[PDB]
Chains A and B, each alone.
Chain A
Amino acid sequence: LIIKHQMKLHLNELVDWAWRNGVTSEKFHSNNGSYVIFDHSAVVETYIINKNDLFNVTEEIEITLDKPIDYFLEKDMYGNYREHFGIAINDLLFLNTTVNIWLVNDDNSHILIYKDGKLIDEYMYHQFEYEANQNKHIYPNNKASGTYPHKT
């Protein structure tokens, strides 16, 4: 169960993500045409990069029982709701009692991943990911934060 996740990151977030998920050599372009070049997992050359510049990066999050999940919500068969941070699903002491497990997406939106004793397949997960936060209005805000740097 591997899920593509495309996001836009500032320079600090992009550098952090690149160093955590090792990149040997790659050039990342930004919203405003600035670029940063990683060579041998070390920053080498950066163009004129202003604040609020957005870089597009796609990361794969894979949801499996054995690997840890950053934030999930578990419902016992008795009716108790608990939340667990950064532990695998199998790491629960008594997985026998657990009925449902929902991933949490930092938007306070729950996506069902574990029901009826088995993981949710990829396509039902896509359906639930669309379905969880339908009426999510994002604030519209645009600032150019740049101008053609050279004298032309």
Chain B
Amino acid sequence: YGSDMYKYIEQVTDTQSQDLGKAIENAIEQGQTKDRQQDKGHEEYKDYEDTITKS
């Protein structure tokens, strides 16, 4: 009797669910760098200029 009978009359499937997730990620990064530059320079030059005048 009652209304609930209709649920059985037409096959009714009630489905539920619940997913509860948790996630913690911890990352530690360290880095070191070492550089070294060594240069050398050398330049040499020569010039000549001759001026002759008449007046």
Contacts and interface: CB of A to CB of B under 8 A. Distances in A.
| 10 A-B pairs with the lowest CB-CB distances in the bound complex, closest first | A78-B26, A94-B24, A93-B22, A97-B24, A94-B22, A93-B24, A78-B28, A76-B26, A80-B26, A97-B26
A89 to B, nearest CB: 16
Interface of B: 22, 24, 26, 28
Secondary structure of the A contact surface, majority rule: loop
Nearest to A97: B24
Secondary structure of the B contact surface, majority rule: loop
Interface of A: 76, 78, 80, 93-94, 97
10 contacts: A76-B26, A78-B26, A78-B28, A80-B26, A93-B22, A93-B24, A94-B22, A94-B24, A97-B24, A97-B26
Contacts of B26: 76, 78, 80, 97
Nearest to A77: B26
A86 to B, nearest CB: 21
Contacts of A78: 26, 28
Nearest to A79: B28
A94 B26 CA distance: 12
A81 to B, nearest CB: 13
